[PDB]
Amino acid sequence: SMSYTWTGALITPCAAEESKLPINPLSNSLLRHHNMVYATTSRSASLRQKKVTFDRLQVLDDHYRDVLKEMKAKASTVKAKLLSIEEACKLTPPHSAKSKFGYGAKDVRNLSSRAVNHIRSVWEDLLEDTETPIDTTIMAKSEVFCVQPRKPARLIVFPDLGVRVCEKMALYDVVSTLPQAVMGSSYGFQYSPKQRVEFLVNTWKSKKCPMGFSYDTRCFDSTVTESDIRVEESIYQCCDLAPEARQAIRSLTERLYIGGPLTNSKGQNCGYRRCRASGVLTTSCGNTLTCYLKATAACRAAKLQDCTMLVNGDDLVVICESAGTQEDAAALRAFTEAMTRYSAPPGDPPQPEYDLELITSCSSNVSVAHDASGKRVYYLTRDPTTPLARAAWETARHTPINSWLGNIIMYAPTLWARMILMTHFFSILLAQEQLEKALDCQIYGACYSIEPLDLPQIIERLHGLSAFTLHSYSPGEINRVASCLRKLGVPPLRTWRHRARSVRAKLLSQGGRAATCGRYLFNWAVRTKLKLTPIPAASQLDLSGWFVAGYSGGDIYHS
């Protein structure tokens, strides 16, 4: 069927939309070529629509039915708990889009009688009505990027806050446990950056002659069919569920997950959806399962050898036993034809790679650096263009989410995150003393409220002391960063070193934790550097739950 149908009404914004980076003193320090940074707006929704709208082609086969059964078999071991209204409400982000029924996120978290009564009614309605499509709002997603040698905005579709709270009750436990029980080590979100690097290396070194490739599905969401969504529910249905949880999942599947009407911000009827809605709790899990299923089956159809998959929602990387240059190009092409039949056509054609560092998955790639000792240490890095553009944007304007804080946590070991991001921001934060102001950022979709003064502990727990001494990065890595700093017009190492030394000092100076920041995060700043040792408070932080499952668009907030 058509992934989308449109009435012709427009996808509208519910407020004004900024697209250009503002001329700002504090923002010019970091990035100079401001006219290169932009934000997507609804003004380009139509371009995205034309690209996501089309009629899906899908042909299942024995390999597909076989992998599905293997997956359903493992799903059978799971027992999922029904979440209480209180626990569900406790998972709702503080600034989640309010309900159109007279209450918002604040009330939901407070457990106010009004928000709770409505959630129950929405739940009762789920147990009783198994057909009526549930309404969803469509909006153009606002994302910053850097011009290219632009990008039309991504589309987001989500239901009312009431329903979202119900999803959590019926499915939170399922989407957080199942992926893991079904795909095992292949499930990406169970890994912190370091562990992913480790899995990618151990998987790589386990083959005699490794051959890997990343696989980019063209607008994965619009490629998800009604069959895929029922196949996905068929997997959930294998869990031991509470009766109401089972009705809720059956009803959420027919009334929301497979499709439904689309309403813009103005109340108008925009059209209909018959594919994955990016804004429901099951998006991340559903996609990870679907992508894993099609890839695992496709790998058998293409005669690829020793298929080790790594899946993160729609992002997919494959590492396997090479069979020869020619043979691998043929096997890989066969793989794409298989995925195309299962309705996962390629965006950019996959390319076999024989150098791990040359593989981009989750917009990242593994790379080598050296620590104080001089021993080789692997870390996860990525082209810094987008992280930096976004940092500039987050410096010039005020935003709910702080990607820089999230990028510093996920990429603390990188040359760019420490040199630029840490220096830039800690400098700005001190100059307004807000090192204690907790900020919100995201990790695998989930929203987190993190304190900037706790970054040393976090970096040591997640990446290890080496992250503070990495040096002698790879040739490829410095080229990228160089090329990047040249492009956006960012001041050279010389300038950052100088700014860091100034931040370090004013940090060691003022106090305790802040001094810890200066001593650890900026140890690369001084020549007569202090010998770094394990930070006590580190093993005190509850990093449980940080890397268990993906929640992109799932409206989740961990406290």
Ligand X SMILES: CC(C)N(c1cc(-c2ccccc2)sc1C(=O)O)C(=O)[C@H]1CC[C@H](C)CC1
The residues of the shown chain that bind ligand X, judged by CB under 6 A, are 415, 418-419, 471-473, 478, 481-482, 485, 493, 524
The overall longest dimension of the chain from CA atoms, in Å, is 70
521, 130 in Cβ contact below 8 A? no
In angstroms, give the least distance from the CB of 516 to ligand X.
Answer: 17
Pick 418 or 424: Cβ nearer ligand X: 418
The answer to whether the CB of 154 falls within 8 A of the CB of 47 is: no
- Token pair 């063209």: residue: 218
226's tokens: 């009604």
In the complex with ligand X, the residue whose CB is nearer, 338 or 419, is 419
Q: What is the dihedral of CA 549, 550, 551, 552, to 10 degrees?
A: 170
Give the DSSP per-residue string, 106-141.
Answer: HHHHHT-HHHHHHHHHHHHHHHH-SSSPPPEEEEE-
Q: Are 297 and 66 in contact (CB under 8 A)?
A: yes
328 labeled binding residue: no
Nearer to ligand X, 20 or 471 (CB): 471
Quick one: which of 323, 328, 345, 334 has its CA closest to 298? 334
Shortest separation between residue 518's beta carbon and ligand X, angstroms: 14
Cβ(68)–Cβ(231) under 8 Å? Answer: yes
What are the Cα distances from residue 34, in Å, to 117, 396, 449?
A: 49, 10, 29
Helices (H) and strands (E) in the chain, counts: 21, 14
Please calculate the CA angle 285-288-294 and round it to the nearest 5 degrees. 135
- Who contacts 512 (Cβ-Cβ below 8 Å, separation ≥6)? none
- Closest contact distance (angstroms) between CB of 422 and ligand X is 8
Q: How many CB atoms sit inside 10 A of residue 311's CB?
A: 28
Nearer to ligand X, 262 or 422 (CB): 422
Q: What three-state secondary structure class fits 295?
A: helix
| Cβ 415 to ligand X shortest distance, Å | 5
Q: How many other C-beta atoms can be found within 10 angstroms of the C-beta atom of residue 131?
A: 7
Minimal distance in Å, beta carbon 127 to ligand X? 56
Nearest distance from residue 378's CB to ligand X, in Å? 15
> Quick check: helix, strand or coil at residue 334?
helix
Buried b (16+ CB within 10 A) or exposed e, 50-89: eebbeebebebeebbeebbeebeebbeebebbbbebeebb
Which amino acid would we find at residue 37? V
Shortest approach of ligand X to residue 30 CB, angstroms? Answer: 15
Taking the least distance from each CB to ligand X, the nearer of 6 and 524 is: 524
* Closest distance to ligand X from the beta carbon of 201 (Å): 21
Q: Which of 127, 98, 95 is nearest to 115 (CA)?
A: 98
Closer residue to ligand X in complex, CB, 262/503: 503
Residue nearer to ligand X on the CB measure, 311 or 420: 420
Whether the CA torsion 458, 461, 462, 466 is positive or negative: it is positive
Between residues 142 and 502, which has the closer beta carbon with respect to ligand X? 502
CB closer to ligand X, 193 vs 286: 193
Query: Is 173 annotated as contributing to ligand binding?
Result: no
Residue closer to ligand X (CB basis): 346 or 476: 476
Beta strands 4-6 and 269-273 are: antiparallel
CB of 473 to ligand X, least distance (A): 4
Q: CB of residue 493 vs ligand X: minimum separation in angstroms? A: 4
Task: Say whether 314 counts as a known binding-site residue.
Answer: yes
483: amino acid identity, one letter: S
Degrees (nearest 5) of the Cα angle 352, 355, 360? 70
The neighbouring-strand residues paired with 272 are 5, 261
Residue 215 has what DSSP assignment? Answer: E
Q: Which is nearer to ligand X, 190 or 365 (CB)?
A: 365
Shortest Å, Cβ 368 to ligand X: 11
- Known binding residues for Mg(2+) are 216, 314-315
- Known binding residues are 216, 314-315
